[PDB]
Amino acid sequence: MAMRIYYIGVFRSGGEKALELSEVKDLSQFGFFERSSVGQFMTFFAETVASRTGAGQRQSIEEGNYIGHVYARSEGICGVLITDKEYPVRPAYTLLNKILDEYLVAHPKEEWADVTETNDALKMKQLDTYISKYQDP
């Protein structure tokens, strides 16, 4: 029923492991008490599936009751959506392509290709909106 999106993030596919450049979550579905551990899980889960994903590869990893939709583009970045196990796939993949197309336009490669960490100029504000908007397709 309630097909939610708990996380959306953009990573830079690197060697060691992907670097999260911009992220947003929606933990309003959990208790105020555990929104700390749940958040931590999301971050770790997102990074884990971003590092596992090769360039030009799209996959959906199942972890418990969540699903990590991830797509690593050739240009070097990788999008990750952590939604409910039964969140509609097609809509999910369409959002990843939207986020990735827009991010690649907004932040040229030289802005994040060689950064040890992320910064404000590498953040994507539209996410704040996309995570709420695309809830329950």
How many Cα atoms sit within 13 Å of 135 on the Cβ side?
16
Q: How far apart are CA 41 and CA 66, in angstroms?
A: 11
Q: How far apart are CA 84 and CA 6, in angstroms?
A: 8
Q: How far apart are CA 76 and CA 49, in angstroms?
A: 15
Resolution (A): 2.5
State the architecture of 1-137 in CATH terms: 2-Layer Sandwich (3.30)
Method: X-ray
Q: Which whole-number Å values give the CA distances from 122 to 19, 99, 102, 117, in the listed order?
A: 11, 13, 12, 10
Where do the domains of the chain lie? 1-137
Helices and strands counted in the chain (H then E): 3, 5
